[PDB]
Amino acid sequence: PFSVKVGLAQMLRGGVIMDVVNAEQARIAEEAGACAVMALERVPADIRAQGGVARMSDPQMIKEIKQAVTIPVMAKARIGHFVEAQILEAIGIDYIDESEVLTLADEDHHINKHNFRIPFVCGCRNLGEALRRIREGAAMIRTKGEAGTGNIIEAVRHVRSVNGDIRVLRNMDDDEVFTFAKKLAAPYDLVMQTKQLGRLPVVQFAAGGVATPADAALMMQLGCDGVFVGSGIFKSGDPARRARAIVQAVTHYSDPEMLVEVS
Amino acid sequence: PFSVKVGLAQMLRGGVIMDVVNAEQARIAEEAGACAVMALERVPADIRAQGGVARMSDPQMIKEIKQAVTIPVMAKARIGHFVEAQILEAIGIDYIDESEVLTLADEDHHINKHNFRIPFVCGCRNLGEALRRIREGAAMIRTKGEAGTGNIIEAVRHVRSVNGDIRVLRNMDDDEVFTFAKKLAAPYDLVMQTKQLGRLPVVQFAAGGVATPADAALMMQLGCDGVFVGSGIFKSGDPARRARAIVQAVTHYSDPEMLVEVS
Amino acid sequence: PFSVKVGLAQMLRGGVIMDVVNAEQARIAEEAGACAVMALERVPADIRAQGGVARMSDPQMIKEIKQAVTIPVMAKARIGHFVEAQILEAIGIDYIDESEVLTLADEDHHINKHNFRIPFVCGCRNLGEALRRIREGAAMIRTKGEAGTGNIIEAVRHVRSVNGDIRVLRNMDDDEVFTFAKKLAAPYDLVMQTKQLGRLPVVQFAAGGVATPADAALMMQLGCDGVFVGSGIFKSGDPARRARAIVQAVTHYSDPEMLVEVS
Amino acid sequence: PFSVKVGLAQMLRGGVIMDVVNAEQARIAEEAGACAVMALERVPADIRAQGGVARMSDPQMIKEIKQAVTIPVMAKARIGHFVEAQILEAIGIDYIDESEVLTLADEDHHINKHNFRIPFVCGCRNLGEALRRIREGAAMIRTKGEAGTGNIIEAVRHVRSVNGDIRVLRNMDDDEVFTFAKKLAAPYDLVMQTKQLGRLPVVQFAAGGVATPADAALMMQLGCDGVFVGSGIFKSGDPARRARAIVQAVTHYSDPEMLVEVS
Amino acid sequence: PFSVKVGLAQMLRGGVIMDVVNAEQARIAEEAGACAVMALERVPADIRAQGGVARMSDPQMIKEIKQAVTIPVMAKARIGHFVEAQILEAIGIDYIDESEVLTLADEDHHINKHNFRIPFVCGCRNLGEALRRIREGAAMIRTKGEAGTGNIIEAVRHVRSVNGDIRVLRNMDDDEVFTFAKKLAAPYDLVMQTKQLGRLPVVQFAAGGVATPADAALMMQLGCDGVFVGSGIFKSGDPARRARAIVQAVTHYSDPEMLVEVS
Structure with missing residues (x-):
């Protein structure tokens, strides 16, 4: 019932997903208006700087x-580690996030x-990878970006690349589509489904570097359906204020005055 | 109605396809027992030696x-030249052969x-190419080989590559199949159909260098369903004898005494 | 009055242009139904065989x-040789063809x-070149191809590349168009005019290798507005028959039975 | 109305723009005679020392x-981050500075x-970049230079490159201008407008390394219309004195005795 | 009597092997339910930390x-050091482990x-190495992995590679098997024995990076017969709990709820 999973992930559209590390951060991220939380032992900042292996x-x-929050709760599973997914x-x-983070x-x-x-929620960096992950069974796609630096250059590049491939496909001649499917190494049936829909057949989130309401609004204006915010929120001067600001930015991504007031 | 085309091409199984250049060579190739002829102006030997463009x-x-023969009659169409196919x-x-020859x-x-x-009859050199051509709509696959030299080393290598990839796929773990589909850059649905069927989902012929009954029997024993014989038959000492010998070799590919008597 | 030149070149749409070398070949190409002739002293085949410089x-x-024909008469002028154009x-x-041939x-x-x-009629190999030539003042564009071989692989590649860039541009996001204009090194105003029109702002012809009615129909079905047929017609078995066949193929580029009857 | 933005940016001609980080530095930069301030949370020195991403x-x-000053107030916006520009x-x-700093x-x-x-105020390093930014909509151009070192070698090189390209264009033959537009990958219409005006169609500022009145006067003598002074004034022995000296040097860029008295 | 050694190593199937460094760690690893211990002076973590040569x-x-435990006791012997094996x-x-660790x-x-x-227990990284070690006399094979990091990417890659070569061999055509034996540089008789058995002719363990019950269950689900757990168990917060959890995970490698409860 893959379509059941797709429809289940649809209710995440237009929301924010926040990396939480305890019940209190989870409660804050809930009260800030997030649609789901990503439970994890210690932030991606630990995975990046402290080193070691993260599971x-x-x-x-x-x-x-x-037990502490009522919203959907996610968790991360290592790539190809299907036993962590079973657990x-x-x-x-x-939701389960097959996380490259x-x-x-x-x-x-x-x-x-x-x-x-x-x-499942699977990372991607271009149209070919997103289509391959959707073929493997991923019911929701998030654009990879770069983990832990707060710099959205790579996330913006990936959103632009995915949406550019979609726009190219939408007008592409039928007789050429096959070659395009070989250029991406993506399943042809999913390529044709994308060409028919004008977008990925699944929900499409952004992740990596989203630190300010401007970044979240920029992601939502580039075509995404939501954002991931991992660590820079709860390590700041006021976590609740920044989390509420990012949530309001995602909700009102087309309101510059609102983006100003929340900033 | 792709399945209609596949079933229509099935009646070519276990036969020989002979390049003809006139009504008399077509009549000979018919009386030798061929299943179909490949009408063309001048032999692949001409295309190779004389040079120039062949259409x-x-x-x-x-x-x-x-009008001269009753068996199915093929013709060659340049790759991607869909107007020659329309004509x-x-x-x-x-049958139409999208011919790289x-x-x-x-x-x-x-x-x-x-x-x-x-x-359509489309050439191939490995499993990925055969699957891509079947996805594009080819109702029958022939392994490329090498055109005009009478040396079956490349045709044998291609038959072995296709059948080896199919045998590898037949046991391959499900969870790995996706990656395999990316390794070939072949549509995943066709890869799974191959894995289920244990063979290429269409009729599979051999071509390139088949000059003696031993070569035809070799191709039919490596797993193919038929052979293509282009020029060396009608340029020899006796065309009817060699054509009948190759037809008998394809029909009796498991009879060494018959292969001897026809040689 | 550039728009006057564009409208003047519009009457060549859906026609054939044939390289003639005398009044007799010009009269034949006229009776075959060509829309214009390209006067030249000795065929591109002579340019290749006799060697030397062609002017x-x-x-x-x-x-x-x-004085011998009534249809528009073209002539070739070397690239950047504005004095030959003045003459x-x-x-x-x-029409003047600033010809790379x-x-x-x-x-x-x-x-x-x-x-x-x-x-003017200017050659091109991609969208950037076509837009640069239209900016310089070319009132009609012909896709370069390859001169003298009768092989349409390069002409088909160039038509597909130009039409593919146009289809990519048609859906491309406005904020990205500027970068696209830098990628092609084409004037941005012409890029935006193309994006608005959905096609190249001038008449777009094909040239190079078109030898059989199938090739002309293929060019006209790939999106072109006409074809150039230079030498292979008058060096053949019957020039009038092949010329009339190619003209009928261009006129009826969507009629397979007509393409058959003319072939 | 791009011309309205151009005329509105004209009042900055012959002035100094100083990066401020508080109301007090802004008040000083106002009283020193600056024409505008570039509000920013922490100087480029902090961007280098604290590291990390700057937004x-x-x-x-x-x-x-x-609210603290009366002069025009600028702000920096990341390149391509149109949501920060909206905010x-x-x-x-x-004025908004699409800042590579x-x-x-x-x-x-x-x-x-x-x-x-x-x-908008956009950086540039040559004539092609300045023309591209003016085509995108930038109503004022500043030459990039190098950020934060106080060494004007790169700013001087870029000012000389822009003015040298303009001088080359001014006499360049019309028939060659097109190729020049391709060499820069700049819009041809803007290239012709530059060739007619003898200078960039917008106000042209200098930035990067301007630390002493001699540097500001040198920029203004190389052909620029103003200078950017970011951090070195407020970290020195006397900020008001050096700021007033640089302002007086820009105002009197042709008075060596004044440059001496202010230094 | 090699078959006696193979049958003797069979009782280790479906168990866990834990590197111990004293009688107390040995006793703990015994009460956790391990099938054997690998006596050694200082853990692979200590081998990595203190550096120097390990014997x-x-x-x-x-x-x-x-004398402290009753289960089988292993020990490590340097590769090719047959005198340590004699001792x-x-x-x-x-059991003796000819250990690359x-x-x-x-x-x-x-x-x-x-x-x-x-x-003997010999390491391996692919099918060729495993077959060579079985030919030299190794009565039990463990997949190498990577020593001391707790990251199972390499161990998983090696298990997948060995099982993939076995699955490829199982369907491989007999006439090709010889060439396969040359591709691996493995004894042909052992290659044919593998092709007949459908698995490596000896007990096959996993080693390197197995730190959590999820990792042990992943190894046992990829086709292995057991796991090696060296150091990370006794340097953790609770050694007995994690050791018992890993033992229960190996025993119940197909029970997700059990893997959850033991975690």
Whole structure:
């Protein structure tokens, strides 16, 4: 029932997903208006600077967070590590993120995400990767970007690349589409579905570097459906204020006066 | 009605296809027991040695051949030259061969073969190319080989590559299949259809260098369904004898005494 | 009055242009139904075989041809050789072809074609080149291809590239168009005019390798407005028959039965 | 109305623009005689020392500065970050600087500056870049230089490059201008407008390394219309004295005795 | 009696092997349910930290461990150091691990393991290496991975590569098997025995980076028969809890709820 997973992930459209590390940060991110939280033991800043290997978050804190908030609760699973995905599905979380922000568990293969009843969130960097992940079973796509620096140049480049490939495909001659599918190394049926829909067949989020309401509004204006905000919110001077500002920016991405007032 | 085209091409299984250049060579190739003829103005030996550009054969001689024999009659169309394919379909031939033996008309794109009611025969060199051509609409695949030298080393290598990739796919773990589909740059749905069927989803012929009954029997024992024999038959000491020998070799590819007697 | 030149070149849409070398070939190409002739002393085949430098055609034979036929009469002028263009305009021909088929007269600069009252026909290989030539003053564009071989792989590649850039531009986001204009090194105003019109702002012809009615119909179906047929027609078995066939193919580029009957 | 923005930016001719970080530095820069201030949260020295990503300055301090001084107030916006530009336009600042001194927000595309009613200030390093930015909608150009070192070698090189390209263009033959437009990858219409005006069609400022009155006078003597002075004035022994000296040097760029007295 | 060694190593199937450094860690790893311990002076983490050369563990502590636990006791022997293997066999340990985790003693040659009555455990990275080690006399194979980092990307890659070569071999045509044996540089007789059995002819363990129950279950689901856990268990917050969790994960590698509860 892949379409069931797609429709389940649709209710995340137009929202913000916030990396939380405890029940209190989860409660704050809930009261700020986020649509879902990404439970994890310690922020991507730890994964980047502290080094070491980062794995699926501990089940006990996932259960604590899930008991603390009412919104959908996500968790991260290493790429190709289908047993972490099995554990997460057995905990009962709402969405699973096959996260490249964590450490690679299988360099060559991703999870055959058709085996789980839980919708997956998979990273991408272009149209070919997004279509491959949707073929593997990912019910929601997020553009990769760059993890931990707060610089949106790569996230902006990836959103622009995905939307540019979509716009190119929308007018592309039928007889050429096949070659395009070979240029991306993406499944042809999904390429034709994209060409018919004018967009990816799934929800499409942005991630990596989104730190200010201006960045979230820029992502939502480039065509995305939402944003991921990981660590810069709760390490700042006031976490609740910045989180509420980013939520309001995503909700009102076409209101410059609102973006000003929230900033 | 792609399945209609596939079933229409199935009756070519276990036969020989002979390049003919006139009504008399067509009549000989018919009396030798061929399943179909490939009408063309002058042999692949001409295309190789004389040089110049080779195009779709002249419509008048196609009509003469079609009126001279009763078996299915093929014709060659340049790659990506869909107007030659339109002309051939309007003449009423039975199969169209998007032939790389001719001159390339579109280096980047092949014909969107779903637009014609006539089944197409497309060349290939590996599993990825065969699957891409089947996705474009080709109702019958022939392994490329090398055109005009009578040396089957490349044709044998291509048959072995295709059948080896299919055998690898047949046992391959499901979770890895996706990556395999990216390695070939072939449509995933066709890759899964191949993995289920244990063979290429269409009829699969051999071509290039098949000159003696031993070569035809070798191709039919490597797993193919038929062979193409272009020029060396009608330039030899006795064309009818060699053509009948190759036909008998394809029919009895598992009878060494028969291969001896026909040689 | 550039728009006057554009409207003047519009009457060539849906026609055939044939290189003639005498009053007799000009009369034949007229009776075959061509829309214009390109006077020249000796065919591109002679330019290849006799070697040496090729220049503007001789004024006396231009006057003879112009007095022999009634259709528009073209002539070739070396690239950047504005004095040959002045001579041609003083003879009174209808269109001037700043032709790369001839020998380069100015490797770095083309003619500032705004100084002549006669419309120009300029070669191109992509969208950037076509837009640059339209900015210089070219009132009609022909896709370069490859001169003298009868192989349409390059002409088809160039038509597909130009039409693909146009289709990409048509959906391209406005904020990105500027960068596109830098990628092609084409004037931005002409890029925006193309994006608005959905096609090149001038008449767009094909040239190079068009030898059979299938090739002409393929060019006219890929989006072109006409074709150039230079030498292979009058060196063949019957020039009038092939010329009439190509004219009928251009006129009926969407009629497969007509393409069959003329072939 | 791009001409309205151009005429509105004209009043900055012959003045100094000083980066301020508080109401007090803004008041000093006003009393020193500057024509405009570039409000920013922390000087380029902080961008180098604290490292990290630098974004649009905080709206609250922009409002404080705007309420503290009477002169036009600028602000910096990341390249391609049109949402930061929207926020700045909604605050009501006078000029927006699409600043490469900040961090790149879009590596491939710049802001489509035609969508805002506020004039923009865009950096440049040669004539092609200045013309491209003027085509995108920039109503004022500043030569890039090098940010934060106090060494004017690069700013001088870029000013000389722009003025040398303009001088080359002024005498350049018309028939060659097109090729020149291709050499720069700049819009041809703007190239011709430059050739007619003898200078860039907008106000042209200098930036990067201007630290002493000699440097400001040198920039104004090389042909510029003003200078940018960012940090070195307020970190020195006396900010008011050096700021007044630089202002007087810009006003009297042809008075060596005045340059001596102010130094 | 190689088959006796193979049957002796069979009782380790479906178990966990834990590197111990004293009688207390050995006792803990016994109560956690491990099937065998790998006596060694200082953990692979200590081998990485203190640097220097690592050799066979000291005989006195091996005797102490062997007297402290009842399960089979392993020990490490440098590669090609057959005298350390003689010493270990004379101590009376149950299995000897010709371990690349230690320092290489013979870079070009491994131990001729047919000379000892004690079964050997040899590392491997692909099918060729595993078959070569089984030919030398190794009665049990463990996939190499990467030593001491806790990252299972390489261990997963090696398990997938070995099982992929086995699956490729299982369907491979007999006439091609010989060439396959040359591609791996593995003994052909063992290649045919593998092709017949559908798996490596010996017990196949995983090693390197297995730190969490998810990793152990992932190894056991990829096709392995067990796991090696060296250092990260006894340097953690609770060694007994994590060791018992990993043992339960290996025992119940197909029970997601169990993997959750033990985590």
